[PDB]
Amino acid sequence: AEKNYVMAIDQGTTSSRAIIFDRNGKKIGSSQKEFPQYFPKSGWVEHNANEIWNSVQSVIAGAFIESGIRPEAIAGIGITNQRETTVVWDKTTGQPIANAIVWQSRQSSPIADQLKVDGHTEMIHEKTGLVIDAYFSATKVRWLLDNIEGAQEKADNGELLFGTIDSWLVWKLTDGQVHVTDYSNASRTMLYNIHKLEWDQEILDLLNIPSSMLPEVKSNSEVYGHTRSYRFYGSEVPIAGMAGDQQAALFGQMAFEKGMIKNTYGTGAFIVMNTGEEPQLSDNDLLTTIGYGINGKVYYALEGSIFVAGSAIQWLRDGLRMIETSPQSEELAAKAKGDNEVYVVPAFTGLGAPYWDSEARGAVFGLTRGTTKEDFVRATLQAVAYQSKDVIDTMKKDSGIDIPLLKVDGGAAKNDLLMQFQADILDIDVQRAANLETTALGAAYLAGLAVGFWKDLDELKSMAEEGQMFTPEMPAEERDNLYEGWKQAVAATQTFKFKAK
Amino acid sequence: AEKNYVMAIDQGTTSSRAIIFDRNGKKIGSSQKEFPQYFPKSGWVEHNANEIWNSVQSVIAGAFIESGIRPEAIAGIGITNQRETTVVWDKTTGQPIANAIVWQSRQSSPIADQLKVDGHTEMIHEKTGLVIDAYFSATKVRWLLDNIEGAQEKADNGELLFGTIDSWLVWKLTDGQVHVTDYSNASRTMLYNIHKLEWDQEILDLLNIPSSMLPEVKSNSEVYGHTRSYRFYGSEVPIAGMAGDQQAALFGQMAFEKGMIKNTYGTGAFIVMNTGEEPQLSDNDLLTTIGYGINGKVYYALEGSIFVAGSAIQWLRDGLRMIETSPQSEELAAKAKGDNEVYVVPAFTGLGAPYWDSEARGAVFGLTRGTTKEDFVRATLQAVAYQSKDVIDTMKKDSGIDIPLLKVDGGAAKNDLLMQFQADILDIDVQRAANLETTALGAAYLAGLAVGFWKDLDELKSMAEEGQMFTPEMPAEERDNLYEGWKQAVAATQTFKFKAK
Questions:
Q1: Fold that domain A1-253 belongs to in CATH
Q2: Shortest CA distance to A447 belongs to which of A90, A14, A21?
């Protein structure tokens, strides 16, 4: 009955993963599994919430199998997830009313556009810290209530429940007894007032979304409940940590103080800076969101979202069929002999921060007869490094402070050439985490703190390990020219706004 | 809780699988997973027994996840397995002393040859119904005790245990509380007397194998014990059915009466005929083994083993890299345009029944400038149909009876073209099971009968499923020419016995 381990579940965009950690933060067992991605229409991205649940069941079992640990030895469970993605389900049957709409989907953009034409931009920003876009949960719920036959009526009759992925997983783990979400995930819905810390009745009324659908909002570190005995191999394990994946990574990077910033390279790339208990500054071209709430306090953050990063490589593999495997991209890019003047702006679903141009589409520039597959792949990889600079330069201007160090993590961070390029273009040190899955580590820490597995933040910091440090080694003239080309490439991309009439 | 399902675990040569069945015998959930194959020296084949256990834990979990059924709803578990494969482990640590030696391995052939030169053939055949060969467990255990430093002494002191895969799995499921095996698996060890129904001391003494290593032998349908709640996802479930995979298939085909025969096409192909409560003395060139023990009686069988069947296709994929995937073989074979005079005799590790020539190796004949990849693949696939005829003709000769019908199952039986060819060459009806995994079905039936899930054999017959029937449609002339060529090819293969030095 000795509880010597904590489990973290990371439900991502294209795969789910579960990891069991010991008191020292060491990985004892891990498992990962992909699940189906659906693209019913150009720009639309959907997931089957039941398939997501099955992938989570699979990796939880997989982690126990690799570790050889008994479920009764788990002290607590932490859950982290792809944010914004929306699920609406029937409370009695627990069956989703349709596929979940992924954060990547643009299917609800017409609703978002209408909200802007009505002049609600400043209003929404004041309350939520966000920009009006189909990226967030709000318009996705509206889309579901508009397009799923009889859904609005069911919702008005209090038969339907809304939830981002964290809420959906806890509902499953507690078999319908707990319907909750944490501050971080709630702030990404565009339905939550991040200053008053409550669901915004004004926005809810505006979008005709009943309150009966909404989960209780709680902190990121506390016992929300426990797994049903039959939901965790006979044990009732405490579910005590919850956070959106990018915020969990911030916590896992131990970015607990104002100014601390990180970038996670995954399906998309997300730069997040801790701004403390007071979001006292300008957040122009960025997002003001809740980093995490612990010990009765709420810590805000500034964020810059780059929608397409790893998915650009997936496109080279599945769309153009240019590369056989995603990891192969690194091999090909390292062999590029071009002048490095080719630019790929993979804005498949619009440009993210600091642009926020939903009308822009993917583009390529500087192509010559000598451009090779290697050059094309290299340009595609470099795009995330360039836009990360666009975001960091914006943060520096908004915060007014200086950023001498960037902590990084995520799958793509494994590419040494790319991380070196990132440091080179930014002209600041880039410190990679000892273990790329800092997202899961962050969730584990939140749960661990809630159940006393770890006594306080200081004990966490004592587990810190030093990861590979990448220092700039590129002249000012070169990096200036490289970045200038990128700026002009994005500008040209933004001029192409063809709309068939 | 209410028990409305039965689970079957089939631990095969290259993969493991778990299937959950309902009262009507319908599949509610299934899962399969491959595990590592090790080839240390040419002719040697080994498995890591812990990796096999992990593959089983994986598919058990996968079957529950796909089915949506809870372990508390399982009435009983049936276990079936690759036969002969040997594991020797430390009773205390539970750790295997080395990799398990697979039935395919020839590493113990020097030990088997030495037994023949010493003239023990008649003695062994009379006691076990088998032939002296590295195929069976006996020489594998001796190999382990000869080559694993300190193993013999630990065995003499009773610290080591021996077990075929079924025994190892039950040992793992009961966390070392039960060390048992069934009649069918014990009969394949070449250490068990199938007439007296007990381990044979004379053979044990001959091979210097301590009786302290041996498991208790029980029937194929009875509760051997219950799972430990932490070894079967939270529940203590009866383990009530156990049988070698080929015998489990025989039971699943419902070949309960004397004369009923079947062939299972998988990694290898095995023809098994039920001989009733009487072991057939006229078994020249074949094997007399135990089919299964149930209702207080023991039913024997006559067997013909074709070692290389599906593994020949695996060879075309991984060895010659002639085909991209195993299923691609059928598509290629269907396109062959040659006159079908190319013969492939895939005796990689020697010829099985009715030849039993351990010195023969793989060979090909009838090649011409016009022979294509398609022709080569078709010839490879046809080899199993030809040797199956060699086996069936031997059974007819030994039993002195006709065989009008042959029931077939197995993953490879899915090839309509191959099954029709089988029927054409044999000139008899070939009835394929509606459910190719009759092996798992047989295991589920044995376990079901043991826990009263099904009351009797007549109830099993009631849920019988009708499969595709294949009738001969090839003229005697073509039929005889095709087969005559095969006989001449095998004869030529047996003349090549080159031994360096």
A1: Nucleotidyltransferase; domain 5 (3.30.420)
A2: A21
* Spatial CA neighbour of A129 closest among A353, A291, A289: A289
Q: Fold identical between A1-253 and A254-501?
A: yes
What are residue B267's phi and psi, to 5 degrees? -60, -40
SS3 B219: coil
Residue B293 gets the label, from left (phi > 0), alpha (psi -120 to 50) or beta, of: beta
| Sign of the alpha-carbon torsion through A21, A22, A24, A26 | negative
Look up residue B82 and give its two tokens. 């690759």
* Measured distance CA(B260)–CA(B275) in Å, rounded: 8
The domains of chain B are located at 1-253, 254-501
Closest chain A residue to B236 measured between Cα atoms? Answer: A234
Residue B309: CB atoms within 10 Å? 27
Residue A415: name the closest of A332, A349, A501 by CA: A332
Residues 6+ apart with CB under 8 A from A307: A104, A135, A268, A347, A348, A349, A350, A352
Cβ contacts of A30 on chain B, cutoff 8 Å: none
Give burial (CB, 10 Å; 0-12/13-18/19+) of B381: buried
Q: How far is CA B63 from CA A169, A182, A484, B19, in A?
A: 21, 33, 55, 6
Q: Which residue has the tokens 């659908």?
A: A213
Q: How far apart are CA A317 and CA A313, in angstroms?
A: 6
B141-144, long-range: CB < 8 A, 24+ apart: B141/B86, B141/B88, B141/B191, B141/B207, B141/B209, B141/B213, B142/B108, B142/B111, B142/B207, B142/B208, B142/B209, B143/B101, B143/B107, B143/B108, B143/B111, B144/B86, B144/B88, B144/B97, B144/B98, B144/B101
Judged on CB neighbours under 10 Å (0-12, 13-18, 19+), B205 is: exposed
B62 and A58: CB-CB below 8 Å? yes
Q: Give the experimental resolution in Å.
A: 1.7
Alpha-carbon gap, residue A231 to B71, rounded angstroms: 11
> A-chain residues within 8 Å CB-CB of B235?
234
Q: In this structure, how many other beta carbons lie within 10 angstroms of the beta carbon of residue B30? A: 18
**Where do runs of H (alpha helix) occur along B183-338?**
183-187, 201-206, 245-252, 310-318, 328-333
Amino acid at A426: L
Sign of torsion, CA A141 A145 A147 A150? positive
Q: Nearest 5 degrees, angle CA B386-CA B389-CA B395?
A: 150
Specify whether the CB–CB gap between A149 and A77 falls below 8 A. Answer: no
- Contacting A with CB below 8 Å, chain B residues are 54, 57-58, 61-62, 65-66, 70, 72, 229-230, 233-235
List the CATH code of the domain at A254-501: 3.30.420.40
Q: Does the annotation list B310 as a binding residue? A: yes
Task: Output the CA–CA distances (angstroms, integers) from residue B401 to A419, B130, B284, in the order listed.
Answer: 76, 22, 15
